[PDB]
Amino acid sequence: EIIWESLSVDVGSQGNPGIVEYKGVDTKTGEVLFEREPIPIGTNNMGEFLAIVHGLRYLKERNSRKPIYSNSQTAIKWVKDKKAKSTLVRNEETALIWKLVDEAEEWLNTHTYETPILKWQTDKWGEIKADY
RNA sequence: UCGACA
DNA sequence: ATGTCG
Ligand SMILES: [Mg+2]
Ligand SMILES: [Mg+2]
């Protein structure tokens, strides 16, 4: 019941909070379609959120109707809400990630999409294909 | 008091 | 260990 014709996204970090990056891959082939340059400080859930929104933008720009898989129940909710409810402190070190989050929320508030955002079922299917 | 997703 | 929701 895996929808193979899909984009899978995941976060990787060093620390949490710590250095965050994320990437999007073709679920079928594992081909890397996008990978964000590491952000010096962020949280796991911020990165999982940014990964989904990046995926939406990526598919929208390419007129693709593929769903997105994420394993993050938090990020899936934040996207649905158009609101990333992070409690990461705001300072000069976290300014960059908070700016990307704000801009992601803004994108969600200014664009439509029909992309299904699906939960990757890790316990049944193993690690998401975008895992680091 | 947890349970769960990461 | 921490970030998050049910
Ligand atoms: Mg994940
Ligand atoms: Mg992972």
Coordinates of N, CA and C (backbone and C1' of nucleotides) and ligand atoms in Angstrom, one line a residue:
Chain A
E1 N 0.8 -1.2 0.0 CA 0.0 0.0 0.0 C 0.8 1.3 0.0
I2 N 2.1 1.2 -0.2 CA 3.1 2.3 -0.4 C 2.7 2.8 -1.7
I3 N 2.5 4.2 -1.8 CA 2.3 4.9 -3.0 C 3.7 5.2 -3.5
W4 N 4.3 4.3 -4.4 CA 5.6 4.5 -4.9 C 5.8 5.7 -5.8
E5 N 4.8 6.2 -6.5 CA 4.8 7.4 -7.3 C 4.6 8.6 -6.3
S6 N 5.7 8.9 -5.6 CA 5.7 9.9 -4.6 C 7.0 10.5 -4.4
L7 N 7.0 11.6 -3.6 CA 8.2 12.3 -3.1 C 8.3 12.0 -1.6
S8 N 9.5 11.5 -1.1 CA 9.7 11.3 0.4 C 10.6 12.4 0.9
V9 N 10.3 13.0 2.0 CA 11.2 14.0 2.6 C 11.6 13.6 4.0
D10 N 12.8 14.0 4.4 CA 13.3 13.8 5.8 C 14.3 14.9 6.2
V11 N 14.4 15.0 7.5 CA 15.4 15.9 8.2 C 16.6 15.0 8.6
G12 N 17.8 15.7 8.6 CA 18.9 15.1 9.3 C 19.5 16.2 10.2
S13 N 19.9 15.9 11.4 CA 20.5 16.9 12.3 C 21.8 16.4 12.9
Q14 N 22.5 17.4 13.5 CA 23.6 17.1 14.4 C 23.3 18.0 15.6
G15 N 22.8 17.3 16.6 CA 22.2 17.9 17.8 C 20.7 18.2 17.5
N16 N 20.0 18.4 18.6 CA 18.6 18.8 18.5 C 18.2 19.6 19.7
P17 N 18.3 20.9 19.7 CA 18.6 21.8 18.6 C 20.0 21.7 18.1
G18 N 20.2 21.8 16.8 CA 21.5 21.8 16.3 C 21.5 22.0 14.8
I19 N 22.5 21.5 14.1 CA 22.6 21.8 12.7 C 21.5 20.9 12.0
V20 N 20.7 21.6 11.1 CA 19.6 20.9 10.5 C 19.7 21.0 9.0
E21 N 19.5 19.9 8.3 CA 19.4 19.9 6.8 C 18.2 19.0 6.5
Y22 N 17.8 19.0 5.2 CA 16.6 18.1 4.8 C 16.8 17.9 3.4
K23 N 16.1 16.9 2.9 CA 16.2 16.5 1.5 C 14.9 15.8 1.1
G24 N 14.7 15.8 -0.2 CA 13.6 15.2 -0.8 C 14.1 14.2 -1.9
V25 N 13.5 13.0 -1.8 CA 13.9 11.9 -2.8 C 12.7 11.2 -3.5
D26 N 13.0 10.7 -4.7 CA 11.9 9.9 -5.4 C 11.8 8.6 -4.5
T27 N 10.6 8.3 -4.1 CA 10.3 7.2 -3.3 C 10.7 5.9 -4.0
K28 N 10.5 5.8 -5.3 CA 10.7 4.6 -6.1 C 12.2 4.3 -6.2
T29 N 13.0 5.3 -6.6 CA 14.4 5.1 -7.0 C 15.4 5.6 -6.0
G30 N 15.0 6.5 -5.0 CA 15.9 7.0 -4.1 C 16.7 8.2 -4.6
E31 N 16.4 8.6 -5.8 CA 17.1 9.7 -6.4 C 16.9 11.0 -5.6
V32 N 17.9 11.7 -5.3 CA 17.8 13.0 -4.5 C 17.4 14.1 -5.4
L33 N 16.2 14.7 -5.1 CA 15.7 15.7 -5.9 C 16.0 17.1 -5.5
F34 N 16.2 17.2 -4.2 CA 16.6 18.5 -3.5 C 17.2 18.2 -2.2
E35 N 18.1 19.1 -1.8 CA 18.8 19.0 -0.5 C 19.1 20.4 0.0
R36 N 18.6 20.8 1.1 CA 18.9 22.1 1.7 C 20.3 22.2 2.3
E37 N 21.0 23.2 2.0 CA 22.3 23.5 2.7 C 22.0 23.5 4.3
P38 N 22.9 23.0 5.1 CA 22.7 22.9 6.5 C 22.5 24.3 7.1
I39 N 21.5 24.3 8.0 CA 21.1 25.5 8.7 C 21.8 25.4 10.1
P40 N 22.5 26.4 10.6 CA 23.4 26.2 11.8 C 22.7 25.7 13.0
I41 N 21.5 26.3 13.3 CA 20.7 25.9 14.5 C 19.2 25.8 14.1
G42 N 18.6 24.7 14.4 CA 17.2 24.5 14.3 C 16.8 23.3 15.1
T43 N 15.5 23.0 15.0 CA 15.0 21.8 15.7 C 14.6 20.7 14.6
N44 N 14.6 19.5 15.1 CA 14.0 18.4 14.2 C 12.7 18.7 13.6
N45 N 11.7 19.2 14.4 CA 10.4 19.4 13.8 C 10.3 20.6 12.9
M46 N 11.1 21.6 13.1 CA 11.2 22.7 12.2 C 11.8 22.2 10.9
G47 N 12.8 21.4 10.9 CA 13.3 20.8 9.7 C 12.4 19.9 9.0
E48 N 11.6 19.1 9.7 CA 10.6 18.2 9.1 C 9.6 19.0 8.4
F49 N 9.2 20.1 9.0 CA 8.2 21.1 8.4 C 8.7 21.8 7.1
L50 N 9.9 22.3 7.2 CA 10.5 22.9 6.0 C 10.6 22.0 4.9
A51 N 11.0 20.7 5.2 CA 11.1 19.7 4.2 C 9.8 19.5 3.4
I52 N 8.7 19.4 4.2 CA 7.3 19.2 3.5 C 7.0 20.4 2.7
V53 N 7.2 21.6 3.2 CA 6.8 22.8 2.4 C 7.6 22.9 1.2
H54 N 8.9 22.7 1.3 CA 9.9 22.6 0.2 C 9.4 21.6 -0.8
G55 N 9.0 20.4 -0.4 CA 8.4 19.4 -1.3 C 7.1 19.9 -2.0
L56 N 6.2 20.6 -1.3 CA 5.0 21.2 -1.9 C 5.4 22.2 -3.0
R57 N 6.4 23.1 -2.7 CA 6.8 24.1 -3.7 C 7.4 23.4 -4.9
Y58 N 8.2 22.4 -4.6 CA 9.0 21.7 -5.7 C 8.0 21.0 -6.7
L59 N 7.0 20.4 -6.2 CA 6.0 19.7 -7.0 C 5.1 20.6 -7.7
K60 N 4.7 21.7 -7.0 CA 3.9 22.7 -7.6 C 4.6 23.4 -8.7
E61 N 5.9 23.7 -8.6 CA 6.6 24.4 -9.7 C 6.7 23.5 -10.9
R62 N 6.8 22.2 -10.7 CA 6.9 21.2 -11.7 C 5.6 20.5 -12.3
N63 N 4.5 21.1 -11.8 CA 3.1 20.7 -12.2 C 2.9 19.2 -11.9
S64 N 3.5 18.7 -10.8 CA 3.4 17.3 -10.4 C 2.3 17.1 -9.4
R65 N 1.5 16.1 -9.5 CA 0.5 15.7 -8.6 C 0.9 14.7 -7.6
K66 N 2.1 14.2 -7.6 CA 2.6 13.2 -6.6 C 2.4 13.6 -5.1
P67 N 2.0 12.6 -4.3 CA 2.0 12.9 -2.9 C 3.4 13.0 -2.3
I68 N 3.4 13.5 -1.1 CA 4.6 13.6 -0.3 C 4.4 12.7 0.9
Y69 N 5.4 11.9 1.2 CA 5.5 11.2 2.4 C 6.5 11.9 3.4
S70 N 6.1 12.0 4.6 CA 6.9 12.4 5.7 C 6.6 11.4 6.9
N71 N 7.6 11.1 7.7 CA 7.3 10.3 8.9 C 7.0 11.2 10.1
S72 N 6.9 12.5 10.0 CA 6.7 13.4 11.1 C 5.3 13.7 11.3
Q73 N 4.6 13.2 12.3 CA 3.2 13.6 12.6 C 3.2 15.1 13.0
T74 N 4.2 15.6 13.6 CA 4.2 17.0 14.0 C 4.2 17.9 12.8
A75 N 5.1 17.6 11.9 CA 5.3 18.5 10.7 C 4.0 18.4 9.8
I76 N 3.4 17.3 9.7 CA 2.2 17.0 8.9 C 1.1 17.9 9.5
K77 N 1.0 17.9 10.8 CA 0.1 18.8 11.5 C 0.3 20.3 11.3
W78 N 1.6 20.7 11.5 CA 2.0 22.1 11.3 C 1.7 22.5 9.9
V79 N 1.9 21.7 8.9 CA 1.6 22.1 7.5 C 0.1 22.3 7.3
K80 N -0.7 21.3 7.8 CA -2.1 21.4 7.7 C -2.7 22.6 8.4
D81 N -2.1 23.0 9.6 CA -2.4 24.2 10.3 C -1.9 25.5 9.7
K82 N -1.0 25.4 8.7 CA -0.2 26.6 8.2 C 0.5 27.3 9.4
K83 N 1.0 26.5 10.4 CA 1.5 27.1 11.5 C 2.5 26.1 12.2
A84 N 3.7 26.5 12.2 CA 4.8 25.8 12.9 C 5.0 26.2 14.4
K85 N 4.4 25.4 15.3 CA 4.3 25.7 16.7 C 5.6 25.2 17.5
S86 N 6.7 25.8 17.0 CA 8.1 25.5 17.6 C 8.2 26.4 18.9
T87 N 8.9 25.8 19.9 CA 9.3 26.6 21.0 C 10.8 26.9 21.1
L88 N 11.5 26.7 19.9 CA 12.9 27.1 19.8 C 13.0 28.6 20.2
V89 N 13.9 28.9 21.1 CA 14.3 30.3 21.4 C 14.6 31.2 20.1
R90 N 14.2 32.5 20.1 CA 14.6 33.4 19.1 C 15.8 34.3 19.5
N91 N 16.9 34.1 18.8 CA 18.1 34.9 19.0 C 18.9 35.0 17.6
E92 N 20.0 35.6 17.6 CA 20.8 35.7 16.4 C 21.2 34.4 15.9
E93 N 21.4 33.4 16.7 CA 21.8 32.0 16.2 C 20.6 31.3 15.5
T94 N 19.4 31.5 16.0 CA 18.1 30.9 15.5 C 17.4 31.8 14.5
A95 N 17.9 33.0 14.2 CA 17.2 33.9 13.3 C 17.0 33.3 11.9
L96 N 18.0 32.6 11.4 CA 17.9 32.0 10.1 C 16.8 31.0 10.0
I97 N 16.7 30.0 10.9 CA 15.7 29.0 10.8 C 14.3 29.6 11.0
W98 N 14.2 30.6 11.9 CA 12.9 31.2 12.2 C 12.4 32.0 11.0
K99 N 13.3 32.6 10.2 CA 13.0 33.3 9.0 C 12.5 32.3 7.9
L100 N 13.2 31.2 7.8 CA 12.7 30.2 6.8 C 11.4 29.6 7.2
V101 N 11.1 29.4 8.5 CA 9.8 29.0 9.0 C 8.7 30.0 8.7
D102 N 8.9 31.2 9.0 CA 8.0 32.3 8.7 C 7.7 32.4 7.2
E103 N 8.7 32.3 6.4 CA 8.6 32.3 4.9 C 7.8 31.1 4.4
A104 N 8.0 29.9 5.0 CA 7.2 28.7 4.7 C 5.8 28.8 5.0
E105 N 5.5 29.3 6.2 CA 4.1 29.6 6.6 C 3.5 30.6 5.5
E106 N 4.3 31.6 5.2 CA 3.7 32.6 4.2 C 3.4 32.0 2.9
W107 N 4.3 31.1 2.4 CA 4.0 30.4 1.2 C 2.7 29.6 1.2
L108 N 2.5 28.9 2.3 CA 1.3 28.1 2.5 C 0.0 29.0 2.5
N109 N 0.2 30.2 3.1 CA -0.9 31.2 3.1 C -1.2 31.9 1.8
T110 N -0.3 31.7 0.7 CA -0.4 32.4 -0.5 C -0.6 31.6 -1.8
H111 N -0.6 30.2 -1.6 CA -0.6 29.3 -2.7 C -1.6 28.2 -2.4
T112 N -2.1 27.6 -3.4 CA -2.9 26.4 -3.3 C -2.1 25.2 -3.7
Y113 N -2.6 24.0 -3.2 CA -2.0 22.8 -3.6 C -3.0 21.6 -3.4
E114 N -3.0 20.6 -4.1 CA -3.8 19.5 -3.9 C -3.0 18.3 -3.4
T115 N -1.7 18.4 -3.3 CA -0.7 17.4 -2.9 C -1.2 16.7 -1.6
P116 N -1.4 15.3 -1.7 CA -1.7 14.6 -0.4 C -0.4 14.5 0.4
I117 N -0.5 14.8 1.7 CA 0.6 14.7 2.5 C 0.3 13.5 3.4
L118 N 1.1 12.5 3.2 CA 0.9 11.2 3.8 C 1.9 10.8 4.8
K119 N 1.5 10.1 5.9 CA 2.4 9.6 6.9 C 3.0 8.4 6.4
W120 N 4.4 8.4 6.4 CA 5.1 7.2 6.1 C 5.0 6.3 7.3
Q121 N 4.6 5.1 7.1 CA 4.4 4.1 8.2 C 5.7 3.3 8.4
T122 N 6.6 3.9 9.2 CA 7.9 3.4 9.5 C 7.8 2.0 10.2
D123 N 6.8 1.8 11.1 CA 6.8 0.6 11.8 C 6.5 -0.6 11.0
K124 N 5.7 -0.4 9.9 CA 5.4 -1.4 8.9 C 6.3 -1.5 7.7
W125 N 6.9 -0.3 7.3 CA 7.7 -0.3 6.1 C 9.1 0.0 6.2
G126 N 9.6 0.2 7.4 CA 11.1 0.5 7.6 C 11.3 2.0 7.4
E127 N 12.6 2.4 7.5 CA 12.9 3.9 7.5 C 12.5 4.5 6.1
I128 N 12.0 5.8 6.3 CA 11.6 6.5 5.1 C 12.8 6.6 4.1
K129 N 12.6 6.5 2.8 CA 13.6 6.5 1.8 C 14.5 7.7 1.8
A130 N 14.1 8.9 2.3 CA 14.9 10.1 2.5 C 15.8 10.1 3.7
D131 N 15.7 9.0 4.6 CA 16.4 9.1 5.8 C 17.9 9.3 5.5
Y132 N 18.5 10.0 6.5 CA 19.9 10.1 6.5 C 20.5 9.0 7.4
Chain B
rU1 O5' 3.4 11.2 36.9 C5' 2.8 10.1 37.6 C4' 1.9 9.3 36.7 C3' 2.4 8.9 35.4 O3' 3.2 7.8 35.4 C1' 0.2 9.8 35.1
rC2 P 4.7 7.9 34.7 O5' 4.4 8.4 33.2 C5' 4.4 7.4 32.1 C4' 3.0 7.1 31.7 C3' 3.0 6.6 30.2 O3' 3.2 5.2 30.0 C1' 1.4 8.4 30.5
rG3 P 4.2 4.8 28.8 O5' 3.3 5.0 27.5 C5' 2.2 4.2 27.2 C4' 1.5 4.8 26.0 C3' 2.4 5.0 24.8 O3' 2.4 3.8 24.1 C1' 1.2 6.9 25.2
rA4 P 3.7 3.4 23.2 O5' 3.7 4.5 22.1 C5' 2.8 4.4 21.0 C4' 2.7 5.7 20.3 C3' 3.9 6.1 19.4 O3' 3.9 5.3 18.2 C1' 3.1 8.0 20.5
rC5 P 5.2 5.2 17.3 O5' 5.2 6.6 16.6 C5' 4.3 7.1 15.6 C4' 4.8 8.4 15.2 C3' 6.2 8.6 14.7 O3' 6.4 8.0 13.4 C1' 5.7 10.4 16.1
rA6 P 7.8 7.6 12.9 O5' 8.6 9.0 13.0 C5' 10.0 9.2 13.1 C4' 10.2 10.6 13.3 C3' 11.6 11.0 13.5 O3' 12.2 11.2 12.2 C1' 10.5 11.9 15.3
Chain C
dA1 O5' 17.6 12.1 28.9 C5' 18.5 13.1 29.4 C4' 19.1 13.9 28.2 C3' 18.1 14.7 27.4 O3' 18.0 16.0 28.0 C1' 19.4 13.5 25.9
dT2 P 16.7 16.8 27.9 O5' 16.6 17.1 26.3 C5' 17.5 18.0 25.7 C4' 17.0 18.3 24.3 C3' 15.6 18.9 24.3 O3' 15.7 20.1 23.5 C1' 15.6 16.9 22.9
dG3 P 14.5 21.1 23.4 O5' 13.6 20.5 22.2 C5' 14.1 20.6 20.9 C4' 13.1 20.1 19.9 C3' 11.7 20.7 20.1 O3' 11.3 21.1 18.7 C1' 11.5 18.4 20.0
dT4 P 10.1 22.2 18.5 C1' 6.7 18.0 19.6 C3' 5.6 20.1 19.6 O3' 4.7 20.5 18.6 C4' 6.9 20.1 18.9 C5' 7.7 21.4 19.2 O5' 8.8 21.2 18.4
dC5 P 3.1 20.9 18.9 O5' 2.4 19.5 18.9 C5' 2.2 18.7 17.7 C4' 1.4 17.5 17.9 C3' 0.0 17.6 18.5 O3' -0.8 16.7 17.9 C1' 1.3 16.0 19.7
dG6 P -2.4 16.7 18.2 O5' -2.6 15.3 19.0 C5' -2.4 14.1 18.3 C4' -2.9 12.9 19.2 C3' -4.3 13.2 19.8 O3' -5.0 12.0 19.8 C1' -2.6 12.8 21.5
Ligands
MG1 MG 11.9 11.9 9.8
MG2 MG 15.4 9.9 9.7

